[PDB]
Amino acid sequence: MLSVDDCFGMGRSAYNEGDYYHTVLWMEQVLKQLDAGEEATTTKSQVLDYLSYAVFQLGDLHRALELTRRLLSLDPSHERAGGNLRYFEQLLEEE
Amino acid sequence: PPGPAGPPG
Incomplete structure (x- = not known):
């Protein structure tokens, strides 16, 4: 597993390349780990x-x-x- | 054009 902030950084990286699909994949995972109470x-x-x-x-x-x-x-x-x-x-x- | 705007970066 990558950390919440790592996954967020991955999503931002994808977004900055205009890769919206990979932005969704990473940001959805961020939300999951935030809902799980991860810091x-x-x-x-x-x-x-x-x-x-x-x-x-x-x-x-x-x-x-x-x-x-x-x-x-x-x-x-x-x-x-x-x-x-x-x-x-x-x-x-x-x- | 008419649309939303995402984060600048």
């Missing part, structure tokens, strides 16, 4: 920021909306996340 400097909101965008790029529309809502719930002053939420809610008529 980490990375926060769930930071993971959700990468993951929500990556799942959208892969065409997973209502999941991207769900994760964007969760992101904002944990980071309400995240202006970009708020803009994303408005986009997805208008796109999917989920306003």
Whole structure:
């Protein structure tokens, strides 16, 4: 096993290469290990920021909306996340 | 264009 923060770094590496699929794989694993109570400097909101965008790029529309809502719930002053939420809610008529 | 924006890096 890699640590939570290692997996997060892997997900960020994939994302910075424009590899959204591998971003999802790593960030999903991060969330699993955070839910298991593993210690980490990375926060769930930071993971959700990468993951929500990556799942959208892969065409997973209502999941991207769900994760964007969760992101904002944990980071309400995240202006970009708020803009994303408005986009997805208008796109999917989920306003 | 009209869309979301992810982390800059």
